[PDB]
Amino acid sequence: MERNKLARQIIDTCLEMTRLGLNQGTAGNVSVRYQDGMLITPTGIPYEKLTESHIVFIDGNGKHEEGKLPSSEWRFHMAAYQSRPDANAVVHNHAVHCTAVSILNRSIPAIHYMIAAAGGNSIPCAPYATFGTRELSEHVALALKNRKATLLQHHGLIACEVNLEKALWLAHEVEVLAQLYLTTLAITDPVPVLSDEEIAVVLEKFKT
Amino acid sequence: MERNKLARQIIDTCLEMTRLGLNQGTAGNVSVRYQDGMLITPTGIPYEKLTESHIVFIDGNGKHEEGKLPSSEWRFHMAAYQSRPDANAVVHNHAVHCTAVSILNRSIPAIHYMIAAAGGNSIPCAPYATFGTRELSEHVALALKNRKATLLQHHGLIACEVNLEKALWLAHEVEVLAQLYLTTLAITDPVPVLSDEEIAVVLEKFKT
Amino acid sequence: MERNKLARQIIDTCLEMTRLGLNQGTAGNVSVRYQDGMLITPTGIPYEKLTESHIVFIDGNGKHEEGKLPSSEWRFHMAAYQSRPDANAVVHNHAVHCTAVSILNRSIPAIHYMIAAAGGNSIPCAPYATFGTRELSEHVALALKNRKATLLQHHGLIACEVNLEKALWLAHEVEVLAQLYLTTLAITDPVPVLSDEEIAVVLEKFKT
Amino acid sequence: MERNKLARQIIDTCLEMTRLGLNQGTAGNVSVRYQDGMLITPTGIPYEKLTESHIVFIDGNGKHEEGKLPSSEWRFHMAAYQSRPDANAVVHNHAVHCTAVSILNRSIPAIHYMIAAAGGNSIPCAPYATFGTRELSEHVALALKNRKATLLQHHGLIACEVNLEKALWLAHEVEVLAQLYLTTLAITDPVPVLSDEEIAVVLEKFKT
Ligand SMILES: [Zn+2]
Ligand SMILES: [Zn+2]
Ligand SMILES: [Zn+2]
Ligand SMILES: [Zn+2]
């Protein structure tokens, strides 16, 4: 767990994210918990020119390394880390289906049993606030109190997990759920959902 | 027909399934009939780290090999094998269009002549029951009595055939039919279908 | 213009067709005009196991080479060649958007100026008839009298041109037009179209 | 900044455009500002057979190099350059979502904060006029007066920027916004938007 290994995974996460179709051109930022703060992708530099030494260290006070410009969205990555002590990785993208659901300002309800991967019977949608602001950061910290993923109204998605592998995986799963919801919603509104008792069985089963 | 050749095809089936866009992140399990039970993919291990010796043998009594954890959905693979003696391979995924049709709880009717590939004038949708349960297993065995593919409400798809090649192929065909149905359904409901006499000509023709 | 060069292009056309997303699993057949009949893809054999010597020669009387089984849809390829003397290549697939428009039994009207690539102000839809029958063949020959592409109700698409390159290209263009029509149709019906005078200017311009 | 380096990027831009799914078969043309006119892709030649010496130089008077046929849509590339002095690269495609929005003849409103990348609170739609005409050229020059991207009714998209990298990037971003708008529009009309004050904060923030 040296710095450069963590920077290679961050870069590999951006690459896989783009290959999975979740990341569409210069949007998206990834981070990992490290020392007293985090390592995050830089602003500006396109994913394919990224090299290990581009990765930026931001400490717990919010100070970033000299000569590097962290992602313009770094503050809600730090919000995530202080609101969810168990989170070690944070993935953010503007994936098209998640973002369309966030434009309608709706939570994703329990239309599939995999909704439980993010911790409960829904994928919440946090209210709009300008990117990079303290106000956005507060909404995200409140939405992640009992969920590992949230939509951001008029914006995109955030997912957090114990490592980058699982955070990408979750991010991906919520984009599938989002696409499932939009496709069925164009046909029938509201969309049929599983009951809370049924999601409670599935959560228990996922613990086992 | 040694064990390792069957395990390479299983792994190759997961890979092709993901490349075809039918398998979206850690969902999906494949099996083949073998000896008195079956070889199935393990739970946990991501498709790309899979190696031949990861494949799990489950006998006819439901006992799995020592030190391996079979897919969490193995029971409906075994249900398939006892309900359809002619089936030698079973493919299961959560492909997005099939699953959206299963959220609406509808069968796919005869909107295209290829519906006959699964044996009749429809692609049925079996009722929801918690993954991995005996109750799910019974619904699947009843849906496969006269069809080689079925949707699973709020969940996904199962397809069975004489070998893995044909099972993947069928799985793929039902995802196309699913997408055809959802796209036309957003425009007109109900969707125009071919009559039963016409599907009966096509079945005879497919036998020849 | 020896046989094997024509068979490599046919095979290359199947490959490109699959890579472009127009051909989804074992559907689709391609042919070229040759001598007194045509070279067509065989039935059964999956596109990726195809080799030059798999290609089947069918003469002008409809007799096929010994030991080879031509595509199950060969008769409407021969219909195309006798109905359009200028056609030297024929491409058929079940591409998802074209086929969805053919399930609604509608022609594609002039929603984009590229509709003129197939010769007029529309992409017609020929009535359903069982695959491989004389009756299907007659509908296709009548739809291609003044168009180079047609939809086949409840089935798919046929496109013909002076060579395989242009036939694939046209096929592709009609799948785009199909997707344009379905996406706008879910929002507004009817969809705005360009007038016949405007398509007449574009045709003249395309001749120049 | 020699000619051949500029021709390699143009060709690389066509390739990336096709790989990103924005360019579907022989549509699309790219240009860069050069000397007193521009370098543009030729008409006819498919993107994959393009070589550096295929690139056509058109001077400020509209005269093209000897023995080369410039794109059939070159005139609105020249319109762009005279209407926006800061533009050094121009990308045009018929990307499916942008074009579907242009068939409905609607501007893309502020459904996402990234709408500000093209300079304001919208992505305008310029009125139809036959491809390659002076009349089309005038509409494009008026739509680009205060925007870096515009839709073309019944046709496609144009994007301009300081270099090819940024022009492709913008083009891509507008196709995402287009897809966001069509997907939400099928569910609710009108689609929720951010207010002008909010886009004004985002523009200021994007300047910083
Ligand atoms: Zn963002
Ligand atoms: Zn499952
Ligand atoms: Zn067919
Ligand atoms: Zn154009």
XYZ file of C-alpha atoms in Angstrom, chain A residues 16 20 110-114 165 169 172-173 175-177 179-181 183-188 191-194 198-199 201-202 205-206, chain B residues 24-27 46-49 73 92 94-97 99-101 103-104 106 128-133 154-156 182 185-186 189:
66
model
C -12.284 0.772 -16.824
C -17.736 0.335 -19.318
C -36.976 -1.214 -5.523
C -37.615 -2.384 -9.094
C -34.962 -5.129 -8.884
C -33.499 -7.083 -5.962
C -29.998 -5.723 -6.625
C -12.958 -2.520 -7.355
C -18.822 -2.373 -9.396
C -21.955 0.130 -12.611
C -24.849 -1.629 -10.840
C -26.294 2.683 -13.870
C -28.007 -0.643 -14.721
C -30.802 0.016 -12.198
C -31.496 2.244 -17.131
C -34.012 -0.373 -15.905
C -36.089 2.385 -14.278
C -36.958 2.033 -19.766
C -39.874 0.765 -17.674
C -41.020 4.295 -16.708
C -41.565 5.246 -20.350
C -44.032 2.328 -20.533
C -45.757 2.471 -17.085
C -43.151 1.107 -11.991
C -43.877 -2.064 -10.043
C -41.584 -2.501 -7.042
C -40.719 -5.190 -4.500
C -38.909 -8.562 0.438
C -35.904 -6.157 0.382
C -35.083 -10.707 3.245
C -32.626 -9.848 0.427
C -29.386 -12.895 2.535
C -26.707 -10.542 1.146
C -23.160 -6.413 -16.485
C -20.823 -6.771 -13.520
C -20.651 -9.799 -11.213
C -24.189 -10.973 -12.078
C -15.116 -11.777 -10.847
C -15.358 -13.272 -14.365
C -11.912 -12.028 -15.469
C -9.995 -13.639 -12.544
C -28.016 -19.124 -7.650
C -28.378 -17.035 -16.491
C -29.558 -10.050 -15.609
C -29.460 -8.626 -19.196
C -31.042 -5.142 -19.178
C -33.883 -5.584 -21.712
C -34.967 -7.768 -16.937
C -36.939 -4.621 -17.814
C -39.617 -6.873 -19.404
C -40.123 -5.897 -14.047
C -43.390 -5.276 -15.983
C -45.135 -9.664 -18.912
C -40.873 -13.512 -8.276
C -39.401 -15.476 -5.346
C -36.175 -14.699 -3.399
C -32.966 -15.656 -5.212
C -31.528 -19.019 -4.147
C -34.738 -20.412 -2.664
C -37.842 -8.515 -11.039
C -34.672 -10.406 -11.819
C -33.486 -11.645 -15.201
C -39.758 -2.562 -25.076
C -44.277 -0.885 -26.479
C -43.252 2.698 -25.721
C -49.715 -0.932 -26.633
